[PDB]
Design a protein that fits this description.
Belongs to the N(4)/N(6)-methyltransferase family. The protein contains 18 helices and 13 strands. The protein is of the alpha/beta class.
Length: 484
Amino acid sequence: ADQPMTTAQQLGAIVKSSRQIMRKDKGLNGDLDRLPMLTWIMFLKFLDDLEQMRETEAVLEGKSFQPAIEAPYRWRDWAAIEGGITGDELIAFINNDEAMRPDGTRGIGLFAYLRSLQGDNGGDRRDVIATVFKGMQNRMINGYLLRDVVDKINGIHFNSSEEMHTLSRLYETMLREMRDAAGDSGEFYTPRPVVRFMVEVMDPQLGESVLDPACGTGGFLVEAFEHLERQCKTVEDREVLQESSIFGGEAKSLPYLLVQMNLLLHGLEYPRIDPENSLRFPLREMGDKDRVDVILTNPPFGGEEEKGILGNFPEDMQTAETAMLFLQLIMRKLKRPGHGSDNGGRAAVVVPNGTLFSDGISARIKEELLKNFNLHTIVRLPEGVFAPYTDIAGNLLFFDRSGPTDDIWYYQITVPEGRKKYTKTKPMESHEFDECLNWWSNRIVNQNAWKESASEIIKYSESGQLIDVNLDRKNPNSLEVLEH
C-alpha cells in the first residue's frame, strides 16, 4: 500500500513553513521574491515525481522513455537526499555556469543546465522547461536555508497524475490568495465554474487547436486539456492529445510561468505561450496558417492600449479600448469554414456590459462581428461573479465563423434568491449552470432565455451610415423591463 497523498492542510503547512524559512534569507524581499522561489522548487519536485510515473508506465507498456531532465540534475539526484548538498556548495550548484555537482563531478550548474535544454524533433517539453528557467532565477543567498526549504518540499507526495493536479490546483489558489492577502490588491481571475461551463459547451475535440490570448495562469487551457484528455481511448489518441497545438498569451511573469508549468505537468508536449503583448501584430498580416479551431478566453474588462498598438487594426476599428481590440484579435484568429471543418473556428469570450452597449468605433467592430460571424448565444451573468477583483457583471459571447448572424439567443442566469450579487466568500457555483446546460441543445424561450435578431439590432441611417449595434439587451421577462 502506497502512502496517501499530501493533504490540503499539509500542503499549506509546507508552503507556510517554507516561506517562514525564506524570511531569514537576506536575498529575498517579500512574496515578490518568495513566491517565484517556491514555484521553481515545487516545479522540479512535481516534474521529477511525474517523470518517475512516466518511466514506470513506459516500462509497463514496453515503450522507450526519454527523460526531460537527466541525472544528476533531477530532483531525486540533488534534492531528495537527506543531508545532501548544502551551504555555499548548494548555491554554487544552483547559480554557476560550472560547479561541483551532487555526484562529486564538476559540470554545468542546475539553472544553466535547465536553460540549455532543447528538444530533439523540433520542439518538445525540454524546450519549454528551458524557456521557463530562462525566465526565473535563484535569489536565495544562503544555501543552508535553501536546503531547508528543499527538505520541506521534498515531503510532498502523490500517487497519480490526478492527485498531482489536485495539489497543483490547491497551490495555485494559495498563491493567488497570498497575492490577494492585502499585498497586491489587484489582478483578475476567471472563476472555475465559469471556465468549466465555457469549456463544456465549447466541447474541444482531440485534433483541434486551442488559443487563449489572455490565459493568465492558464485556467481555460488547462480545463480544455483535461476535457481533451477524457476523450482518449487509444495510444494514438494520447499522441494527438500530447501533441495538441495549444496557444496562449500572458503578460504577467508568474502567471506566464504557471500556465506553462501546469500544462507540462498535464503531459502537453509544447504549450506555446507568448509573454509579450498579444495585440502587437498586424491583423492584416494574419491568415489561415495563423488560425485555430477553438478560442476560450477572458480578455481584460478594461484598459487602453498605447497608440503604437492601434496601427495593427483596421483604419475604422482603431479604438484604444483593450477589451475591443482583443475582440478583433479573436475574430481574426478563428479558422474560416472549409479549412478542416464546416463551421470554421468557434470562440467563447467573457466581456463586460460595456462591450455590449458601446457605440462609435465599437459599433463598427460589432457590425463586422455580426456580418461575418455567427454570434449564436450570449449568456448574461449576475454582478459579483468576479469578486473580489470587481463586482462588474460579466457576459459570455459564443460565436463561430460559419456565416453571418441571424437569431441571437440570450440566456440570463440570476443570482440565487435573497441575494443581489455573488461574493468572495459566497461565489457562483457550477450547479447554477445546470439549467443552462440542459437548455443549450434544447432551446426554447422561457423565463431566462429569449431571442433577438441581428437585422433588428444593427441600425443604419438612410444614407446607410452605421448608427448603432447595441447588444446590451434586457430579459423581456425581467422586472427592469416592467417598470424600467
